[PDB]
From Swiss-Prot, chain D:
Residues 75-106 are annotated as: Disordered. It is found in: Mitochondrion. Component of the mitochondrial large ribosomal subunit (mt-LSU). Mature mammalian 55S mitochondrial ribosomes consist of a small (28S) and a large (39S) subunit. The 28S small subunit contains a 12S ribosomal RNA (12S mt-rRNA) and 30 different proteins. The 39S large subunit contains a 16S rRNA (16S mt-rRNA), a copy of mitochondrial valine transfer RNA (mt-tRNA(Val)), which plays an integral structural role, and 52 different proteins. Interacts with MIEF1 upstream open reading frame protein. The chain holds residues 44 to 295 of 311 of the full protein. Keywords: Methylation, Mitochondrion, Ribonucleoprotein, Ribosomal protein. This is Large ribosomal subunit protein uL4m. One of its GO terms (biological process) is mitochondrial translation. The lineage of its organism: Eukaryota, Metazoa, Chordata, Craniata, Vertebrata. GO terms for molecular function: RNA binding; structural constituent of ribosome. The modification Omega-N-methylarginine is found at residue 104. GO terms for cellular component: mitochondrial inner membrane; mitochondrial large ribosomal subunit; mitochondrion. Its main location: mitochondrion. Belongs to the universal ribosomal protein uL4 family. The gene is MRPL4.
UniProtKB/Swiss-Prot annotation, chain G:
Pfam families: Ribosomal_L27A. It comes from Homo sapiens (Human). The gene is MRPL15. The lineage of its organism: Eukaryota, Metazoa, Chordata, Craniata, Vertebrata. HAMAP family: Ribosomal_uL15 (MF_01341). Its main location: mitochondrion. This is Large ribosomal subunit protein uL15m. Signal peptide: none annotated. Residues 31-47 have a biased composition (Basic residues).
Curated annotation (Swiss-Prot), chain H:
The gene is MRPL35. GO terms for biological process: mitochondrial translation; translation. Its main location: mitochondrion. Belongs to the bacterial ribosomal protein bL35 family. Disulfide bonds: none annotated. GO terms for molecular function: structural constituent of ribosome. Component of the mitochondrial large ribosomal subunit (mt-LSU). Mature mammalian 55S mitochondrial ribosomes consist of a small (28S) and a large (39S) subunit. The 28S small subunit contains a 12S ribosomal RNA (12S mt-rRNA) and 30 different proteins. The 39S large subunit contains a 16S rRNA (16S mt-rRNA), a copy of mitochondrial valine transfer RNA (mt-tRNA(Val)), which plays an integral structural role, and 52 different proteins. The chain holds residues 94 to 188 of 188 of the full protein. This is Large ribosomal subunit protein bL35m. It is found in: Mitochondrion. It comes from the Eukaryota. Keywords: Mitochondrion, Ribonucleoprotein, Ribosomal protein, Transit peptide. GO terms for cellular component: mitochondrial inner membrane; mitochondrial large ribosomal subunit; mitochondrial ribosome; mitochondrion. It comes from Homo sapiens (Human).
UniProtKB/Swiss-Prot annotation, chain I:
The lineage of its organism: Eukaryota, Metazoa, Chordata, Craniata, Vertebrata. It comes from Homo sapiens (Human). It is found in: Mitochondrion. Disulfide bonds: none annotated. High relative levels in skeletal muscle and testis. Lower levels of expression in the heart, brain, placenta, lung, liver, kidney, pancreas, spleen, thymus, prostate, ovary, small intestine, colon and leukocytes. Expression is coregulated with TWNK. It comes from the Eukaryota. Belongs to the mitochondrion-specific ribosomal protein mL43 family. This is Large ribosomal subunit protein mL43.
Length: 97, 110, 41, 252, 87, 85, 291, 95, 107
RNA sequence: ACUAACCCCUAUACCUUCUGCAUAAUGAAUUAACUAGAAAUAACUUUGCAAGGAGAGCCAAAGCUAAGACCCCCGAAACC
């Protein structure tokens, strides 16, 4: 019980597909391009997560302040509740003071 | 950074002097920083540990270590405590000796 | 990334094998067997 | 014929000597030894800093990563707003909701809270220094070759593979040229159908690609481009404003 | 393979759609046009005359400086009066 | 997911489609304008900048209107801008 | 000589460096601690039951009920008006001599705030209530250079040292609005705005800049010669006659009090893209920029 | 103490310590004496004299005040004619 | 424990050493991978020591098979039929030599 | 341990709470799965540069930048 009685199907990985064979290209565009472009501008992803990093609390304010007006009603309510809980936990709880 | 202008007399009023040309014939060599200064700095840790560091060293760093403690033993009274880092080409001495080492490294042609 | 233990069967077998010659349910139930194997050791 | 000779245009420190590299050509199978090129000692002959390589490669892989994994908490699982049974008198364990982490189908106590970013930037001089170390490692391991230009007699991809096999270059070769708009037609059609052989411009050169590919080849304009770009780092002021703004001597 | 073309900054000034709601307001004011002209010169199409303030905004610009920034003589006279008062 | 437009843009968006999009231009412009009313229940500062007595510094000041509630009966009268506070 | 050669040659015999043989430098990665196992699992380093174990400890600075130490200390005006106090980054004669000797500052041309920041001699933060630089008297004995320097503040000894070598030192005021422009002209020119005239010094600073002994830029020039003689007599150095110097024209070059740069009248527009200067011609514009 | 603000997500500063304490750039903290303006008629001149100086805090209090104050107040300031300018650095300090 | 593990009396094989000593190790089989970090210790062991070990023990037959594998192994057979299998997964050279020498002395 | 399962000799279940539990103090019939340490102010370690560091802002009387590494789960009666 709790373990499979047969071997899982073997997995095949293409180490030389288009994405793997050219990962990291243009990451030094700023150094080698007279600083006309920043490697941060190559970041592809969420609007509030482009060239920025922070803890869970900080990510919630940044999402709310930038795209909060466009979120769904249920999602906005949950995001507001998450900020309230995170604010209480970080500013009032912990081993260290 | 602009290259320093040539003065008819040396050392300059601020105390700067260009490295001697040709460079000294030694197994080790120390190159000036990008501001044309001897790479000697003071380091402090824990608020009471004082160290002197020498950067931008390539060649036989052990020869430099041998020369450093020979030069510092009469001043300090015993063999100084030193750390040798080969991968980064730096030499660390316990205590503050920046002004003597800069003077010592200056007259050696570095 | 969700991680789950996959070798728990071997983790309990290394204890149950030392209790194979015992008497009662404490030779096959891990919760009982671990308490008596420690005493035996 | 007449050999091709390349000198170091940037001034060299007095205590250092240039490192020589052979110059080949791709127009023939046996067309090596076209000439000699002098490389800057401070770029192709610097210290073998493996730790610098490891941290630069780790920076490249993990700075553009964004994780989209996210799990609902007990406040986001549907329902569970009512106390199941009274606290005392029922004879069973006390609970306040059916969506608690202990309950089956409940929330997750400490789970992923995506999307999350791992973006961080190494110091500018360190990233440039990583390229110098990798080039020096390539030269020392004799897997780096210097060419004059990337024109091929035929655009046949099998011809390129046979040429690489004859010269014992390696399983995978990373090709680097000056500018994307200056690609010869033969090299583009030859490498487009090849997997282990990749063609990228000079601006696209990176440590991760160099480590992934056993063999690296550069053109003479590429070498001068790399020498100029890298040697600008170690003799420069601290930036008053971003370099994209006009300067007295930037761009050179 | 062959790499995709390098990502370059798009040449020429950007002029967004003034009638589109999604365009931010900071890209529509004369300040945005002034920045475009400085970066791209006469090729941006911005009239150089519009850079200097029109007479409509100059009248309060001098009114503000007159009311808030006193002249040298006024400051010196005020200082001399205070010096006499403390003496 | 995320909406293409912000929620507060929705009212403007429907005005550009349907029967509302066929309204006369002059009426649409008049309704679109959102000019501030004349102060009634609060006294305007009257100046863009003022000197703080505490530190003797010049700081910018603003006039924030006070919310006013208009009962439905006032629509049949002429209150002159006054309303319930 | 041999260290680099030995390290590189030793690399040749080693296998090819790839992505499968990289490791961080020792001591640079402290392993992460997790609350698992016997050593760190029973109580996870929280102690016995209580506020600390349950993570409900009071706020920082709370001593369990007695009057807080920081509260019971009486208030005093230590940092009142700190955001309105004026700050000046100190500049030493040794630093100036160090810059001149290394060539980062050109003494054959007038030296001001723009030149100092261009040579990276000083760092100015106008957002941090900075108002310029002050010339301090440190290392006045070893200073020997003929320069024309413009600094917001100066000491009586720093002025004497500059004038001893035949140099000229003057004090001028820069408002916070134009101070950022002076330190970083390039970002300002990209703003696409005409060059504004700098404001007059405040009422409290007017006496400082109208006094000859401070070498103020608004003081009477006729009061300068007697002031220089007093400094020369006090410190016992013969005052040189710089009128006979071949750099007399360069020494006398001073900017208008309403001017920002040299040769750039207020109200002009700089176009770096096409390397052009645009000047207004409206009579209202000209009167505003010149008065 | 607010470790993460709700509008910017950064540590705040307790303004109570700002109005009562002065910090030197060397790390020392300068404070007044409690009750130095209270009931002066019932205190001897020697007691009143020692009540009106500026005294330093110990290691624990200095750590307490640093944690309640953001890095803005720990910077080096260059105020003109600052009375406490000479006290911002320590001289001849061993260990 | 002893109560949970079978026991035996102390004994030898055919009174070995009474008239002469006969080496009890009879066969050794080594599995080595040409490529793979797990076989590096096994690889260098046979480059410098397997030759000297073979000369030291002439009555023991050693087989070295080079095939792809994730865990290098050594198999020892004795004249009594006992078979011992030891993994060489990621060990050094001075410790495989001690490990190999230990199997030689065992009965 | 033994030739030998038992017979011989030795040995007061686990966790938690308390100064102290074989304790007749709580918890557990058993099995499978699920279920609980979140943050970088300072300090430490390791690179890079260095009177400068940093890809505008910030800090600096050897500092500056970067990285590593410390802060749990369930449960009320209630209030609107
Ligand atoms: Mg240090
Ligand atoms: Mg309820
Ligand atoms: Mg509840
Ligand atoms: Mg423990």
């Amino acid at each position: 019980i709790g373990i499979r009685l047969t071997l899982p199907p073997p997995k095949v990985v293409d180490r030389w597909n288009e994405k793997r064979a050219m990962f990291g290209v243009y990451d030094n565009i700023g150094i080698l391009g007279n600083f006309e472009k920043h490697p941060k501008e190559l970041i592809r992803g969420p609007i509030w997560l482009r060239g920025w990093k922070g803890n869970e609390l900080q990510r919630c304010i940044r999402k709310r302040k930038m795209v909060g007006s466009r979120m769904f009603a249920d999602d906005l309510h949950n995001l507001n509740k998450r900020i309230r809980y995170l604010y209480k936990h970080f500013n009032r709880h912990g081993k260290f003071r | 950074i602009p290259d320093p202008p040539k003065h008819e007399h040396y050392p300059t009023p601020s105390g700067w002097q260009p490295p001697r040309d040709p460079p000294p014939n030694l197994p080790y060599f120390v190159r000036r920083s990008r501001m044309h200064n001897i790479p000697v700095y003071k380091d402090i840790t824990h608020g009471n540990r004082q160290m002197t560091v020498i950067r931008k060293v390539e060649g036989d760093i052990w020869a430099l270590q041998k020369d450093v403690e020979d030069f510092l033993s009469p001043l300090l009274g015993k063999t100084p405590v030193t750390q040798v880092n080969e991968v980064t080409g730096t030499l660390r001495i316990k205590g503050y000796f920046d002004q003597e080492l800069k003077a010592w490294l200056l007259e050696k042609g570095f | 990334l969700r991680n789950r233990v996959t070798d728990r069967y071997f983790r309990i077998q290394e204890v149950l094998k030392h209790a194979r010659h015992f008497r009662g349910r404490k030779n096959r139930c891990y919760r009982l067997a671990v308490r008596t194997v420690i005493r035996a050791f | 014929p007449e050999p091709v000779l390349r000198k170091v245009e940037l001034p060299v420190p007095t205590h250092r000597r240039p490192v020589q590299a052979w110059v080949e050509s791709l127009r023939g199978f046996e067309q090596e030894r076209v000439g000699l090129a002098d490389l800057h000692p401070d770029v192709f002959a610097t210290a073998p800093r493996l730790d610098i390589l490891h941290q630069v490669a780790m920076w490249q892989k993990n700075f553009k990563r964004i994780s989209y994994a996210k799990t609902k908490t007990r406040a986001e699982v549907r329902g569970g707003g009512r106390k199941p049974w009274p606290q005392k008198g029922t004879g069973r364990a006390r609970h306040g909701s059916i969506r608690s982490p202990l309950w089956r189908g409940g929330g997750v106590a400490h789970g992923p809270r995506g999307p999350t970013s791992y973006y961080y930037m190494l110091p500018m001089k360190v990233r440039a220094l990583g390229l110098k170390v990798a080039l020096t490692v390539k030269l020392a391991q004799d897997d780096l070759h210097i060419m004059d230009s990337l024109e091929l007699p035929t655009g046949d991809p099998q011809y390129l593979t046979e040429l690489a096999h004859y010269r014992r270059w390696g399983d995978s070769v990373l090709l680097v040229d000056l500018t994307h708009e200056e690609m010869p037609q033969s090299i583009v059609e030859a490498t487009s159908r090849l997997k282990t052989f990749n063609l990228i411009p000079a601006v696209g050169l990176n440590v991760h690609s160099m480590l992934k590919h056993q063999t690296l080849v550069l053109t003479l304009p590429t070498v001068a481009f790399l020498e100029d770009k890298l040697l600008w780092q170690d003799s420069r002021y601290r930036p008053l404003y971003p370099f994209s703004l006009p300067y007295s001597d930037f761009p050179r | 393979y062959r790499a995709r073309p390098p990502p370059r900054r798009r040449p020429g000034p950007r002029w967004p759609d003034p009638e589109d709601l999604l365009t931010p307001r900071w890209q529509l004011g004369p300040r945005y046009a002034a920045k475009q002209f400085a970066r791209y010169g006469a090729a941006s199409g911005v009239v150089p005359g519009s850079l200097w303030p029109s007479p409509e905004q100059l009248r309060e610009l001098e009114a503000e400086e007159r009311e808030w920034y006193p002249s040298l003589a006024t400051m010196q006279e005020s200082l001399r009066v205070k010096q006499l008062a403390e003496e | 997911p995320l909406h293409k437009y912000p929620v507060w843009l929705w009212k403007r968006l429907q005005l550009r489609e349907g029967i509302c999009s066929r309204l006369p231009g002059h009426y649409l412009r008049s309704l679109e304008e959102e000019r501030t009313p004349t102060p009634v229940h609060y006294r305007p500062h009257g100046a863009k900048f003022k000197i703080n007595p505490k530190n003797g510094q010049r700081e910018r000041v603003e006039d924030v209107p006070i919310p006013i509630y208009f009962p439905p009966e006032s629509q049949r009268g002429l209150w002159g801008g006054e309303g319930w506070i | 000589q041999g260290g680099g050669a030995r390290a590189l040659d030793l690399l040749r015999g080693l296998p090819r460096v790839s992505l499968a043989n990289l490791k961080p430098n020792p001591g640079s990665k402290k392993p992460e601690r997790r609350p698992r196992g016997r050593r760190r699992g029973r109580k996870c380093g929280r102690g016995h039951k209580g506020e600390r174990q349950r993570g409900t400890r009071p706020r920082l600075g709370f001593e369990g009920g007695q009057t807080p130490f920081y509260i019971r200390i009486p208030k005093y005006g230590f940092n009142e008006g700190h955001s309105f106090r004026r700050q000046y980054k100190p500049l030493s004669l040794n630093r100036l001599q160090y810059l001149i000797d290394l060539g980062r500052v050109d003494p054959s041309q007038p030296i001001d705030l723009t030149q100092l920041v261009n040579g990276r001699g000083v760092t100015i933060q106008p957002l941090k209530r900075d108002y310029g630089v002050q010339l301090v008297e440190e290392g006045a004995d070893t200073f020997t250079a003929k320069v024309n320097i413009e600094v917001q503040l100066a000491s009586e000894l720093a002025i004497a040292a500059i004038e001893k070598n035949g140099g000229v030192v003057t004090t001028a005021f820069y408002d916070p609005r134009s101070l950022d422009i002076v330190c970083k002209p390039v970002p300002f020119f990209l703003r696409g705005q005409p060059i504004p005239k700098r404001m007059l010094p405040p009422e409290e600073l007017v006496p400082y800049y109208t006094d000859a002994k401070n070498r103020g830029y608004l003081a009477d020039p006729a009061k300068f010669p007697e002031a220089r003689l007093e400094l020369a007599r006090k410190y016992g150095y013969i005052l040189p006659d710089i009128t006979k110097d071949e750099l007399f024209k360069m020494l006398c070059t001073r900017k208008d009090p309403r001017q920002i740069f040299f040769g750039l009248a207020p109200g002009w527009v700089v176009n770096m893209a096409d390397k052009k200067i645009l000047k207004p011609t409206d009579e209202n514009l000209l009167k505003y920029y010149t008065s | 103490l607010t470790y993460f603000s709700a509008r910017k997500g950064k540590r705040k500063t307790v303004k109570a310590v700002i109005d009562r304490f002065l910090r030197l750039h060397c790390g020392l903290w300068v404070r007044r004496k409690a009750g130095y303006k209270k009931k002066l008629w019932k205190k001897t001149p020697a007691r009143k004299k020692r009540l009106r100086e500026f005294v330093f805090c110990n290691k624990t209090q200095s750590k307490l005040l640093d944690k309640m104050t953001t890095s803005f107040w720990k910077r080096r300031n260059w105020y003109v004619d600052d009375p406490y300018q000479k006290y911002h650095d320590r001289t001849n300090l061993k260990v | 424990t002893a109560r949970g593990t079978p026991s035996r009396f102390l004994a030898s094989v055919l009174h070995n050493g009474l008239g002469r000593y006969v080496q009890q190790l009879q066969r050794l089989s080594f599995s080595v991978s040409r490529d793979g970090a797990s076989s590096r210790g096994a690889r260098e062991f046979v480059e410098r020591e397997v030759i000297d070990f073979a000369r030291r023990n002439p009555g023991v037959v050693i087989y070295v098979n080079s095939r792809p594998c994730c865990v290098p192994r050594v198999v020892a057979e004795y004249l009594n039929g006992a078979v011992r299998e030891e993994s060489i997964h990621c060990k050094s050279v001075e410790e495989i030599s001690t490990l190999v020498q230990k199997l030689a002395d065992q009965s």
